[PDB]
A paper describes a structure:
Using genome-wide transcriptional and functional analyses combined with structural and population genetics studies, we conclusively demonstrated that a single amino acid change in the binding pocket of the glutathione-s-transferase epsilon 2 (GSTe2) gene, coupled with increased transcription, confers a high level of DDT resistance and also cross-resistance to pyrethroids in the major African malaria vector An. funestus. The topology of GSTe2 indicates that the 221 amino acids of the An. funestus GSTe2 (afGSTe2) are divided into two distinct domains similar to that of An. gambiae (92% similarity between the two species, with a difference of 20 amino acids). The active site is located in a deep cleft formed at the interface of the two domains, specifically by the interaction of H1 and H3 from the N-terminal domain and H4, H6 and H8 from the C-terminal domain.
To identify the structural changes responsible for the higher activity in the resistant GSTe2 Benin allele (119 F), its X-ray three-dimensional structure was determined and analyzed in comparison with that of a L119-GSTe2 susceptible allele cloned from Uganda (UG-GSTe2). However, significant local differences can be observed between the alleles at the C-terminal ends of H4 (containing the L119F mutation; residues from 113 to 128) and H8 (residues from 213 to 220). These differences can be described as a concerted movement of the BN-GSTe2 H4 and H8 helices with respect to those of UG-GSTe2, which opens the active site cleft. However, to accommodate the bulkier Phe119 side chain in the Benin-GSTe2 structure, the N-terminal end of H4 has a dramatic bend, which increases the size of the H-site in comparison to the UG allele, where the cavity is tighter. An assessment of the DDT dehydrochlorinase activity of the recombinant 119 F resistant enzyme (Benin) and that of susceptible L119 revealed that the 119 F allele is 3.4 times more efficient at metabolizing DDT (82.9% DDT depletion after 1 hr reaction in the presence of the cofactor glutathione (GSH); P < 0.001) than the L119 allele (24.4% depletion). This is confirmed by their respective kinetic parameters, with the 119 F allele having a higher catalytic efficiency (kcat/Km ratio) for DDT (316.3 μM−1.s−1 vs 92.0 μM−1.s−1). Overall, these structural analyses demonstrate that the L119F mutation is the causative mutation that confers DDT resistance.
Author numbering:
A (entry chain C): 3 to 35, 55 to 220
B (entry chain A): 3 to 34, 54 to 221
């Protein structure tokens, strides 16, 4: 069976949890002593690689990660947008607060994230980030957005496509448990730590 | 035929060129979010997705991108290492110099890049980034490293594995044309731009 070494506050861990639930898989989650998957002794690391692996090994169809090279290319592109832009820019803010005891968020880092929101809005021409169907790229993207939006405000009037997209994902029965709670809490924890650092 | 809208200075563009050369493919490059591949009407975008697409369509074996889910997972992880860590941290530095007229590189961004160097050194337990065999993840990582190492010094004594891996890649007949020249020139262009910015 599938063991996940994980922290629920962690966005890439939640991206995997979302994936495991969409595949109908049960995850035994373990705290560290991320994410790291133990599939029967075989160790898989890095959230995107894990998600691809899980769909490849355990998907009964390929809707979450297509076999067709062209369709698959669009999901792959979206996965790298998440790692290269969405996650990278959030981490640029969070790390300074979490590990280096800083209390300020530099203005240009807020702006870098605000720009990533506009890029995301632009990609949401269809209902989901890689096209008309929901894929693991949506899981990767929402695990990050649901965390950072509690820190760098994501304006409803300026991002209608993103809120519709979030509302779609919130219609998944497993959304709140696999992702929503943890992402909301990660935002609150960043804000609490930011304030604590200044004391 | 394969058409690539591209800029040779761009790391993700060079990662694709290395891939095309390794597959024995010819590319028609057009000067322009890049690169964009036009494969007989089929439009693929984003370098990692292009690379996987090309190996999938035109690969004669699965060396560059394995069919084995576990091995493929190692390559996938290294690809996202390149996108989320190496490239992103390079961009945090270059954008400031290119678009905002800055001449300094903040100390924390330098260390951020040097930390990515340590992580890469750590992953090179075998000869290549995803193991003992060369893959498109090597092409992705080297396209970025060959550019940033000209700006944020990568010390030999502290990164022997990186210098060994680089020397291995330099043994590829197509390395210098597809990547080496453009990565070195991007680095020099960054330094030149940085100096110019400080001059009133």
């Amino acid at each position: 069976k599938l063991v996940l070494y994980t922290l629920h506050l962690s966005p890439p861990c939640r991206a995997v949890e979302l994936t495991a639930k969409a595949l109908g898989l049960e995850l035994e989650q373990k705290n560290i002593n991320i994410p790291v998957l133990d599939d029967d002794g075989t160790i898989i690391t890095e959230s995107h690689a894990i998600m691809i692996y899980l769909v490849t090994k355990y998907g009964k169809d390929d809707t979450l990660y297509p076999k067709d090279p062209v369709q698959q290319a669009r999901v792959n592109a979206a996965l790298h947008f998440e790692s290269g832009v969405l996650f990278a820019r959030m981490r640029f803010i969070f790390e300074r607060i979490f590990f280096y005891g800083k209390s300020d968020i530099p203005e240009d880092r807020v702006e870098y994230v605000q720009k990533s929101y506009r890029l995301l809005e632009d990609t949401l021409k269809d209902d989901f980030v890689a096209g008309s169907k929901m894929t693991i790229a949506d899981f990767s993207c929402i695990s990050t957005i649901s965390s950072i939006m509690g820190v760098v405000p994501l304006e409803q009037s300026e991002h209608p496509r993103i809120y519709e997209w979030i509302d779609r994902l919130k219609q998944l029965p497993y959304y709140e448990e696999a992702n929503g709670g943890g992402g909301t809490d990660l935002g609150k924890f960043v804000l609490a730590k930011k304030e604590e650092n200044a004391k």
